[PDB]
Design a protein around this ligand. Sequence first.
Ligand SMILES: [Au+]
Ligand SMILES: [Au+]
Ligand SMILES: [Au+]
Ligand SMILES: [Au+]
Ligand SMILES: [Cl-]
Ligand SMILES: [Cl-]
Ligand SMILES: [Cl-]
Ligand SMILES: [Cl-]
Ligand SMILES: [Cl-]
Ligand SMILES: [Cl-]
Ligand SMILES: [Cl-]
Ligand SMILES: [Cl-]
Lengths: 172, 172, 172, 172
Amino acid sequence: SSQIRQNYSTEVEAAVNRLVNLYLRASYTYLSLGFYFDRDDVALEGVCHFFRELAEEKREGAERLLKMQNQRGGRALFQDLQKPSQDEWGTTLDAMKAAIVLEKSLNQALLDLHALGSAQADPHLCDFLESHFLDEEVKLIKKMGDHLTNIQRLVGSQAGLGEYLFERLTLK
Amino acid sequence: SSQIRQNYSTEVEAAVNRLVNLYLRASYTYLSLGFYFDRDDVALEGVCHFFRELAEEKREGAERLLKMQNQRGGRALFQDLQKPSQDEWGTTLDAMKAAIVLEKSLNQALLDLHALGSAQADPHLCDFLESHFLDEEVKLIKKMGDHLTNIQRLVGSQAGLGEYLFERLTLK
Amino acid sequence: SSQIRQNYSTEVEAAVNRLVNLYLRASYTYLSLGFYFDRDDVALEGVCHFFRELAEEKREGAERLLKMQNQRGGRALFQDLQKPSQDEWGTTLDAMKAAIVLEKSLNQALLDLHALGSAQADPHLCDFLESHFLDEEVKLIKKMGDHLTNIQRLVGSQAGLGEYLFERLTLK
Amino acid sequence: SSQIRQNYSTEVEAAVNRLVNLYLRASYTYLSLGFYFDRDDVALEGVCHFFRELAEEKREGAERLLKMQNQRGGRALFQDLQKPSQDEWGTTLDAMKAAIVLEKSLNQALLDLHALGSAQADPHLCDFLESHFLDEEVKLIKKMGDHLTNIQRLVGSQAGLGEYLFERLTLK
Ligand SMILES: [Au+]
Ligand SMILES: [Au+]
Ligand SMILES: [Au+]
Ligand SMILES: [Au+]
Ligand SMILES: [Cl-]
Ligand SMILES: [Cl-]
Ligand SMILES: [Cl-]
Ligand SMILES: [Cl-]
Ligand SMILES: [Cl-]
Ligand SMILES: [Cl-]
Ligand SMILES: [Cl-]
Ligand SMILES: [Cl-]
């Protein structure tokens, strides 16, 4: 094992590789979401942009994890990336529900890794997560929940009209 | 025939003159569309501007074709320009449907000319079309289809209100 | 099928989805290559940067293909992304050999799609590829071949020293 | 004891004083390393600069610890500073090996203090270390390991030549 490795368990090393896979899968899911909203028969540009920027954020999260893996002397191992869960994503409301489920699953994976780090007495890992992921995730989930509430208020009213207005006046 | 003409069939020469006529007719149709939306009893300024800019684009397309005709040593021949197909164009939805039909007909004329060029082994013609028309047309048809979808989503809801909102928040 | 679709075969539509998968797989392979060269026991920063920028180029290629799919009225379909072919990539010479093999395979997929487009008389597709992919790929393959020749000249001489010098004076 | 002291154990107070001594000793060791590489019979300016900047970083670390000691109401206590472990430091490779051993020993002292803080439920201490030391140390150890790998690749080849090239093209 590495000349630099110190206080870095094989358990954390493996869980970091699994989290990289989760973040790349999330990136891929957002890519599919973004391009679905660019379809000529969907055509919500603000929604497409919201999801495409999240695809970039999640890829950046994976990259940060891979950089940290190398800084600690662990070894990146990549696995197949499963396709997204759907090929068509419904309405903006359906899509945002799927996105908040996905973010909560990433958040739970972060909390599980933090707990592992704490059991392993790995404070560099705990600080890394705290500093670069946990607050980011909380803020994003809050934003999504705000969006869900606004979308729901709009599309209870008159669904197409509300979906257009949300895109135009919140997202764009 | 011209001192400069080389590899330029009479078949392409004539088809180019016909395409000039199609593009000027399209320009004329957009002029009528634009001024219909400026009527005091229609009064959708963003829609009028959308169509008036397309009238200018189609005239510019004709001019490019005429410049190319002369560059190749062909001879521009003009024919009567038929009036547009309607004197009143209905709702924004009706108008955008008529505009996408018109653009698909121009696109099909471009593809037919390209095929002729390819049968005649005229790569200058093929490159000209590829470079200055085919991608332009695809992008425009995609934009129109996006607009149709947004208009349809709005005017299913409450038709006058949706038509105003589309004009104000997408077109203007 | 789409209100905008015109002259866009189901054969091209499917082959475009397959090419998106090839380009994302290539991106993933470059991500693994880049992070391998960032290992503390490999530690060739210029090499890591070369491959990480190629990961971004290939992702951008996929995105362009997906944008074009939607512009034509086709439907993006994503499949699982297979992991890269290796977990460790050897020397810079080994890595660059693997990268040129990968780029030739992408190039062959582009040429095959172009041939399909030509058989389908789809000049928008042919122009898209010509304009945004084929020359890009030729230039990249030439650059890689230049690199291979320089690496081989260096590491025939005294292998570690040559690998350092290439990184420092060509890549960095 | 101090009018400001709150939740600050005598165990942490003493361990902080010991860590100040470790950091000043490390500073002193880097001063000796730096000036060894400035000898006319060693004469590797980039290496001298690398170590002299580390002498400044370690002194700055001690100063931060002393500032924190006073902020918490503890009392700085200084002890004799032991001389560095060697008077001559060999090759760049020997020196960098000695530097990574030294940094791992500082890192282990940081982890031990963090564990003490955690046993004492002293989150201000834990955050201080996390924020100002633990990531700094990981990044430095990674850099040193990168350097070791490059030095080893060079001096396996032809030792004097490799040592010059590393100094010139990585350090300087
Ligand atoms: Au921890
Ligand atoms: Au041709
Ligand atoms: Au073609
Ligand atoms: Au603590
Ligand atoms: Cl372990
Ligand atoms: Cl799956
Ligand atoms: Cl002829
Ligand atoms: Cl008529
Ligand atoms: Cl078909
Ligand atoms: Cl596989
Ligand atoms: Cl105490
Ligand atoms: Cl001593």
